[PDB]
Amino acid sequence: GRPEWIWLALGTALMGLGTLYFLVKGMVSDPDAKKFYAITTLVPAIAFTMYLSMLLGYGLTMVPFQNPIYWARYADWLFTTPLLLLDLALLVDADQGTILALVGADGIMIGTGLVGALTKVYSYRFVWWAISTAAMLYILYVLFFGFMRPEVASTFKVLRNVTVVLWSAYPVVWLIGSEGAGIVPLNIETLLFMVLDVSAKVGFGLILLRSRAIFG
Amino acid sequence: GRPEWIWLALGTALMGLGTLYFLVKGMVSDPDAKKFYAITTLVPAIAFTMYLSMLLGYGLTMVPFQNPIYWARYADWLFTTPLLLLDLALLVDADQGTILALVGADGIMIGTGLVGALTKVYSYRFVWWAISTAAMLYILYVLFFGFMRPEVASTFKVLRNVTVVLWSAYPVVWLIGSEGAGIVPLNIETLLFMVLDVSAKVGFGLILLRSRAIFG
Amino acid sequence: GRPEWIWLALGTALMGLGTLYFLVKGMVSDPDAKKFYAITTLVPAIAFTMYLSMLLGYGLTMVPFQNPIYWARYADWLFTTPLLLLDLALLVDADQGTILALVGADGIMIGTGLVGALTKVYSYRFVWWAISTAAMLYILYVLFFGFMRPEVASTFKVLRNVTVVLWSAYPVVWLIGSEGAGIVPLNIETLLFMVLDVSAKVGFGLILLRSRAIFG
Ligand SMILES: *C/C=C(C)/C=C/C=C(C)/C=C/C1=C(C)CCCC1(C)C
Ligand SMILES: *C/C=C(C)/C=C/C=C(C)/C=C/C1=C(C)CCCC1(C)C
Numbered sequence A, B, C: 001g002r003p004e005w006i007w008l009a010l011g012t013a014l015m016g017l018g019t020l021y022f023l024v025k026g027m028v029s030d031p032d033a034k035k036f037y038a039i040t041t042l043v044p045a046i047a048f049t050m051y052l053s054m055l056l057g058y059g060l061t062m063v064p065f066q067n068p069i070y071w072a073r074y075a076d077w078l079f080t081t082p083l084l085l086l087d088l089a090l091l092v093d094a095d096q097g098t099i100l101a102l103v104g105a106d107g108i109m110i111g112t113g114l115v116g117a118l119t120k121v122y123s124y125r126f127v128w129w130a131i132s133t134a135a136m137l138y139i140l141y142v143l144f145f146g147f148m149r150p151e152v153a154s155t156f157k158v159l160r161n162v163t164v165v166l167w168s169a170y171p172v173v174w175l176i177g178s179e180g181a182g183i184v185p186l187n188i189e190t191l192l193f194m195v196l197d198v199s200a201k202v203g204f205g206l207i208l209l210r211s212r213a214i215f216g
């Protein structure tokens, strides 16, 4: 019924297939590699469920500021974005202190994202967007300045670059889409997030899980 | 007022008493044993609070598909089921990678359980049930195939068998009860969950905390 | 508009400034010290966001028992109180078992706090208050009886004393304020929590982050 259904359906499909691929691929005894397979398989598994929830209409609510807001995205990102950061952190043997900073900053990013998404005073939505963007920028700063076997170095560099590029798109899509200024229709916005989500999840995992960096 | 009150009241009582028993019993210097006492005491403490919430009417909502759904169960299981899995994982010195898989799969199980519980399209409730059951089955697979001092071996075998049997009952009760097909009345369903919950929590803890497997 | 706005605004300001101070101060290579800076900076960062949410009206709901309840407090405390306990636990090199007990007990404290805050049967609100207070008392007991370099000893003693005093005020404020008996107006209650929150967060962090106890 809703025009964006096609992109929700494809996202569900692609997340589903990616999960099954990583699950089959991970069938691995090396403790380190097992950690990467676990993190990297859980990511699209979670996204699969949240995409499904949006397709079926459960992960959608109306916010008066009567705007269709897919809140399920934030339930997804609350878990999947810290997991993706753990993949990076583990590659480089990050100190626990740096892990907590990343995870905590990420929680703030998604939580303020959600508050902004659900806020009924239009102008205040963008205050929450700004705070969330600050947390994102802190995360990007830590990834470049806050942190090594050569193969770990090469793979970390690729994944970090992928991360900086894709993650930076999210706040732009939100600002111009139905959560923000409403300059890009919900249908197109759903498509953008779908492309970003699959790349950031399945794309990312493929690069990581095909590299020898994950073995001790 | 509501017929199931008696089973909510007994569950609250039994969870309460089990918590106090484990608390008194744990009054223990061995680091390993302290970890088991903590996990195993927190479990029925959480369940106590969620049983209380249901007795008092706070953990109950009406879902139109006007069906009384005790959502408090899922707030309980979200924390207590991973904790029970940590008890198992620690016994056998599981690799962190295997722990994340178990915990993550468990989160998916309960989260999709909850979505199914609260879904307003009747047919879709059972799609969520199926996904949750898949996650449960993955958990059971890991417990048997994804993993040792003899006393650890004996105790792990008992607890794992208890786990496989009791946990497998939960999806059956849900399917036939008020969350699913509505073939078994809410009153009887509440009783089944109460028996399962106490066994899976207090029964489980008694077997674990009386074994010498918990000491290094 | 609402009289308590001034205290929400100052709390937001003070939490904001404290976060920036700790962030600048932490600009530190020692792994141990990094852990303390992370925990201690995240704390007022979270509180900043939740104070903002209350100022802007998002973190407030009406509970019929038509009472204005700031639920945002509990979203704050759910994360910040375990973090503050981790600061203490790490100082003294607590066993993981003791950490889980503290964190778990803290989760119960805040969760039952929230249930009480949102409960529509007046008398039952204080049952939840009593359970939460029991969990708090268990936490205080562990801090004194459940647990060392001299500088670690001195700093831990100060922070623990600060903790026992400030934390014990929270249940009293709740009982006499708008969540409980309604003997102290919401405006004054908001002020009390603001003073307690800043002391418990910024005060606490200043004492910790100025001590040499945080370096290995
Ligand atoms: C698989 C999903 C991924 C990698 C999602 C990343 C999402 C973000 C980095 C979102 C950031 C946002 C802001 C920085 C501002 C407010 C809007 C958000 C939550 C989209
Ligand atoms: C103390 C509580 C325990 C051990 C609960 C275990 C609960 C489950 C294994 C529930 C499983 C479910 C499914 C597998 C399908 C959907 C319905 C659920 C959530 C009951």
Ligand SMILES: *C/C=C(C)/C=C/C=C(C)/C=C/C1=C(C)CCCC1(C)C
Binding pocket: C077, C080, C081, C084, C109, C110, C112, C113, C114, C116, C128, C129, C130, C132, C133, C136, C167, C168, C170, C171, C174, C197, C200, C201
């Ligand atoms: C920064 C915030 C801090 C340190 C908050 C501490 C809050 C508590 C210790 C609250 C305790 C409560 C009870 C013990 C009973 C019910 C009411 C609560 C949640 C305020």
